[PDB]
């Protein structure tokens, strides 16, 4: 598994039972025309970069 | 001749009414005055359990009594200030005028 | 200055009771009952002994001085208020009672209260709190 | 949580109904013309009525109000 970092481009909602994992969509920085949607744990604003351990997991949207 | 007046009340507006009235009385009987100095308000605070019995959530009243005290100094003779203090006082304000 | 000197005593012998010499003297004398923190410090204040020494680098002259000052306290200008057996109920002698006599004086006081049949002796013999505490909630350790 | 209540909104609509000419655009001026023209027994309510007067008069220079 290669390590890829990607920039949050819009924050969408909170997911999880205790309302703890902020669901955002990100776009990868080398493949800037590509996007994915990730459940992200913690304090997240728009415009920060996440270190994805894998590019390919994509979650549901509630 | 350095006769001093102290004004003391639980009320603030009546006290300051009486003190400004005495300042204007001293001015119309034409003698200088060191102004009404305001010493700090003494609070009398009481915290009691609201309940007569023992049970309940342990709640507490917070009763307060504010006491205001102010001072007026006059270099003047005695009957002038005696006849100015014989008039124009509210019931809430205690007046104490000493000579020395 | 810091090397082990020869004849370094790892242990000493005072009133048939051991004195660990690896510690420091003001706290090594404390190992026998009847002398503690402050009485140990004051006894070796009266004895001309530097407090920085450890109890294995003393000499037998100095430990003889220390044991004489502990056994005869008030004629080395230890005050009367600094003792533990002040005005005792047999001979009235102000002296510091030490290790093997300490439990003797304790148990003689115990037997005096027993055969005098007082309340505090009854509480001792019953195995209770003799100094007026509460037994309803605290002290369930020894008595089941 | 800044919602002007009915005692603010009703009074501001009455002020702008009967005194639209002297009211203007800035909070500090029409605050004191509202304090001259009404009996508002507290400064906090006075300021909130004045601010809502400013806001809906900006709505009036947008267009007509219901």
């Amino acid at each position: 598994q290669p390590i890829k970092l990607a920039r949050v481009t819009k924050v969408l909602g909170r997911t999880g039972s205790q309302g703890q994992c902020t669901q955002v969509r990100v776009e990868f920085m080398d493949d800037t025309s590509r996007s994915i949607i990730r459940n992200v744990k913690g304090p997240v604003r728009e415009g920060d970069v996440l270190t994805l351990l894998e590019s390919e997991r994509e979650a549901r949207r509630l | 001749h350095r006769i001093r007046i102290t004004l003391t009340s639980r009320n603030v507006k009546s006290l300051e009414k009486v003190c400004a009235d005495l300042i204007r009385g001293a001015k119309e009987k034409n003698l200088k005055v060191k102004g009404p100095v305001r010493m700090p308000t003494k609070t009398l605070r009481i915290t009691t359990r609201k309940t007569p019995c023992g049970e309940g959530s342990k709640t507490w009243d917070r009763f307060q009594m504010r006491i205001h005290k102010r001072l007026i100094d006059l270099h003047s003779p005695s009957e002038i200030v005696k006849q100015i203090t014989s008039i124009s006082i509210e019931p809430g304000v205690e007046v104490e005028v000493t000579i020395a | 200055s810091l090397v082990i000197p020869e004849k370094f005593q790892h242990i000493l012998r005072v009133l048939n009771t051991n004195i660990d010499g690896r510690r420091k003297i003001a706290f090594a004398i404390t190992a026998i009952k009847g002398v503690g923190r402050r009485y140990a410090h004051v006894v070796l204040r009266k004895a001309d002994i530097d407090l920085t020494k450890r109890a294995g680098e003393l000499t037998e002259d100095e430990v003889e001085r220390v044991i004489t000052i502990m056994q005869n306290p008030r004629q080395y200008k230890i005050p009367d208020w600094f003792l533990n057996r002040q005005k005792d109920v047999k001979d009235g002698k102000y002296s510091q009672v030490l290790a093997n006599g300490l439990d003797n004086k304790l148990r003689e006081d115990l037997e005096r209260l027993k055969k005098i049949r007082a309340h505090r002796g009854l509480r001792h013999f019953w195995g209770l709190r003799v100094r007026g505490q509460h037994t309803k909630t605290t002290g369930r350790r020894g008595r089941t | 949580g800044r919602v002007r209540t009915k005692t603010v909104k009703k009074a501001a609509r009455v002020i702008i109904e009967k005194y639209y000419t002297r009211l203007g655009n800035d909070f500090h001026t029409n605050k004191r013309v509202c304090e001259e023209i009404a009996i508002i027994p507290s400064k906090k309510l006075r300021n909130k009525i004045a601010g809502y007067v400013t806001h809906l008069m900006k709505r009036i220079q947008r267009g007509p109000v219901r």
Binding site: - | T47, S57, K58, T59, W60 | - | -
Partner: protein, 142 residues
């Protein structure tokens, strides 16, 4: 010339410190003693932040004597940290150009803006039914 004395307060939690700046040489001392022995000396660059951020050339013609009262140790040391900078900024307000005032002020603010404005925070009141301001005692069932 005339005595160019400005007396400025600096406020932390309850420790208030009024500084007093005149025409003179660069004499900065607080409560009759210099800055370099004011305990706690852990916060020694806290006192030195106005003089280190501005240089002694700006503190050259100004002697500042500070009297401090109230609060605790670091509250006093933050009140002195505020009061020196505010005393210098009021001297440069009233007796020289205000281009100097603006450059001294934004050099202060671009490091730390609590050098000039204060903390309005104080210890809030203990409500009943708790050990402190908003902690409560331990509720127990069964």
């Amino acid at each position: 010339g005339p005595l160019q004395s400005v007396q400025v307060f600096g406020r932390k939690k309850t420790a208030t410190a009024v500084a007093h700046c005149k025409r003179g040489n660069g004499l900065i001392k607080v409560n009759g003693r210099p800055l370099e022995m004011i305990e706690p000396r852990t916060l020694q660059y806290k006192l030195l932040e106005p003089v280190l951020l501005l240089g002694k050339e700006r503190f050259a013609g100004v002697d500042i004597r500070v009297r401090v009262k109230g609060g605790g140790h670091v509250a006093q040391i933050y009140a002195i940290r505020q009061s020196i900078s505010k005393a210098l900024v009021a001297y440069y307000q009233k007796y020289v150009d205000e281009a100097s005032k603006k450059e001294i002020k934004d050099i202060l603010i671009q490091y730390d803006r609590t050098l000039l404005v204060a903390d309005p925070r104080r210890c809030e009141s203990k409500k009943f039914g708790g050990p402190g301001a908003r902690a409560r005692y331990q509720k127990s069932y069964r």
